[PDB]
Amino acid sequence: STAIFSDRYKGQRVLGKGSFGEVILCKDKITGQECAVKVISKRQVKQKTDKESLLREVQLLKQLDHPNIMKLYEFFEDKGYYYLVGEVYTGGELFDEIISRKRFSEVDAARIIRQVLSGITYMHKNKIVHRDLKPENLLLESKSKDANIRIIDFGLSTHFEASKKMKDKIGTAYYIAPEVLHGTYDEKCDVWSTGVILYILLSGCPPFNGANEYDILKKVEKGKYTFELPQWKKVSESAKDLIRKMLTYVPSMRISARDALDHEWIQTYTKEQISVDVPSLDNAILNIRQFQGTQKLAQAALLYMGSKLTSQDETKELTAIFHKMDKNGDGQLDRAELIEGYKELMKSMLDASAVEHEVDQVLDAVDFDKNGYIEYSEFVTVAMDRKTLLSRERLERAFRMFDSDNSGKISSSELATIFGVSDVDSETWKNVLAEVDKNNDGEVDFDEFQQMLLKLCGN
Ligand SMILES: CCOc1ccc2cc(-c3nn(CC4CCN(C)CC4)c4ncnc(N)c34)ccc2c1
């Protein structure tokens, strides 16, 4: 008598959007236990393996316990999706915590990387590979300063094919091992990705960089990088040595995770007391804040455009569904019919209970309430404005966070960087600017930027 996810768990709120789908904060309807549920849509995400292979991996993952690996509790499957139920962590992504600090040293970076290597070492002993390791996959257990790191998504890449949409692969190219690109890879690919992360922690710049995804990959495939940035003069020789060993091109010659744990640099800078020479890496922390702000604004711009395209689709679809449900032809509908069409639109709303409450938030939001006969036209406007909120609000937030000098504007040099990261062709975005403001002087305010994004998604 195979069990059913929504019989045991109720959705509370959305936590985020990650690799392969949405992560939802959920609650056990009996015990009250809160959990983070990754919901994988079978239609959007193709499987690479067979069901037998996926179920065996899940059964193994549930039995593993390590302080630096996200704990998986439960797995469910229905007709339309897969549900992975794990422990919820509230510290956010590591890099977003790092940029809030005013002090950051080699000791802080070694504490960090020792946890990651310790988690990876354990999973490789159990023959599980991550493959897609990156800063976004490093969560902090809690918002405390002393918080442990938890790696998420260990093992999913083997069974599910990653999205080819740019909104989903932002900041993936920097960390992928070169052997992964060419097809023959093993567990050493996780040491490479960790090496890239360490390079960034100590310099604030990716070792392999470029103006678009494909230029970055051309750099990764060649394998060449350097330590001639000025801020490497402040960094121990020991740390550089570990990096060279992790970023070794030929995987059989690259250091193992387990050996990396024993490296002098990890042994020296993780002893809690000895500060033999420990400066603060001020340039690095500010490079990381620039890096992070750039990536967050490009990501928010793509989700803004995506949300605007969805709201065009859903507005028209919902209107045609309501039109056909309107047997009177008077343009009015009752509550149950509004619920029925919104559910028909279906295909965060994990059960019928989720839908009824969204509709109720909109019927409350219909300003003042007359009960029986509701103007389907206005419900559509408000239901959809609701859906875009998180993404327009988030767009402005990310613009303000990128504009660190509070100038109110972003330069065309900055736009080139942002649109390169978002993979929007150069000729295309300038044509668009030229049409928004025929007189501009190489910089745009938030409203102009916003108008550019709308033109770049056909509005
Ligand atoms: C086999 C593992 O299956 C799972 C189960 C739960 C998961 C949960 C998360 C997760 N994802 N998230 C939030 C988003 C994860 C992706 N980031 C880019 C944005 C935040 C979580 N927040 C708190 N706790 C969590 N557990 C998560 C990520 C991957 C998961 C994979």
Residue numbers in the entry: 42 to 388, 395 to 506
From the article:
This argues for flexibility in the orientation of the piperidine substituents even after binding of these nanomolar inhibitors, and allows additional chemical modifications of this group if necessary to further optimize PK/AMDET properties. The inhibitor structure-activity relationships (SARs) of NcCDPK1 and TgCDPK1 for all compounds tested are virtually identical suggesting that similar BKIs could be useful for both toxoplasmosis and neosporosis therapy. Our data shows 1294 had a 2.6 nM IC50 against NcCDPK1 enzyme and 32 nM EC50 against N. caninum tachyzoites. We have experimental evidence that N. caninum is prevented from invading the mammalian host cell when lead compound 1294 is added at the time of infection. A therapeutic oral trial with a BKI, 1294, demonstrated marked reduction of N. caninum cerebral parasite burden in mice, thus demonstrating proof-of-concept for neosporosis therapy.
NcCDPK1 is 96% sequence identical to the well-studied TgCDPK1. The structure of NcCDPK1 as seen in both the apo and inhibitor-bound crystals is consistent with the “inactive” forms previously seen in calcium-free crystal structures of CDPK1 homologs from C. parvum (ApiDB_CryptoDB:cgd3_920) and T. gondii (TGME49_101440).
